[PDB]
Write a protein that binds this ligand. Structure first.
Ligand SMILES: *[C@H]1O[C@H](CO)[C@H](O)[C@H](O[C@@H]2O[C@H](CO)[C@H](O)[C@H](O)[C@H]2O)[C@H]1NC(C)=O
Ligand SMILES: *[C@H]1O[C@H](CO)[C@H](O)[C@H](O[C@@H]2O[C@H](CO)[C@H](O)[C@H](O)[C@H]2O)[C@H]1NC(C)=O
Ligand SMILES: *[C@H]1O[C@H](CO)[C@H](O)[C@H](O[C@@H]2O[C@H](CO)[C@H](O)[C@H](O)[C@H]2O)[C@H]1NC(C)=O
Ligand SMILES: *[C@H]1O[C@H](CO)[C@H](O)[C@H](O[C@@H]2O[C@H](CO)[C@H](O)[C@H](O)[C@H]2O)[C@H]1NC(C)=O
Lengths: 10, 99
């Protein structure tokens, strides 16, 4: 599928 | 300095600073700090095609395709892989493929 992103960690 | 046959480049409009990739390579999760989010033009070599995203990691098919020399005016409203008309003039990720 399409590449995804994730939220930056603290 | 112009892109080689098998290389694609983005070039900062403001500074002339270049970011280039050979055919077969992509960027990190984001472009480096020294170019990310600067307005660019594309200089793609004769056998190369530059894939940009306005987001990190070439993600969600937010992808536009550029060949040859493209000015930022012509990257503001480009049909993406996902069928949206996006602005790729200030890219966050990149891949270079064969044209
Ligand atoms: C989106 O990012 C992904 C990494 O999180 C990955 O690099 C992906 O590119 C695809 O990766 C596949 C291997 O996972 C195949 O190699 C495929 O050919 C390749 O497109 C990134 N998408 C894009 C379009 O580069
Ligand atoms: C974004 O979410 C995806 C799941 O919906 C996935 O976890 C993706 O992580 C990547 O998945 C790739 C498979 O297409 C490879 O396995 C890659 O190693 C992995 O990072 C998420 N992307 C990121 C960059 O974390
Ligand atoms: C990962 O970072 C992206 C920008 O680099 C973007 O914020 C993305 O947000 C996700 O975008 C998807 C687009 O279809 C969905 O709208 C999803 O809901 C949304 O979170 C980031 N992904 C995540 C999982 O945080
Ligand atoms: C979102 O979480 C991801 C793990 O689920 C991952 O840590 C990702 O961080 C990015 O990961 C990339 C490789 O998948 C690169 O290493 C990149 O440097 C790194 O930022 C998380 N997103 C963010 C924005 O950090």
């Amino acid at each position: 599928a399409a590449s995804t992103t994730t939220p930056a960690p603290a | 300095l112009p892109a080689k046959e098998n290389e694609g480049c983005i070039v900062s409009v403001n500074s002339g600073k270049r970011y280039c990739l050979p055919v077969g390579q992509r960027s990190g999760y984001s472009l480096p700090d020294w170019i990310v989010g600067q307005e660019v033009y594309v200089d793609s070599g004769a056998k190369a095609k530059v894939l940009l995203s306005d987001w990190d990691n070439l993600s969600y098919n937010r992808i536009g395709e550029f060949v040859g020399n493209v000015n930022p005016a012509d990257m503001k409203k480009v049909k993406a892989w996902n069928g949206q008309y996006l602005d790729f003039s200030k890219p966050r990720s990149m891949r270079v493929v064969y044209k």
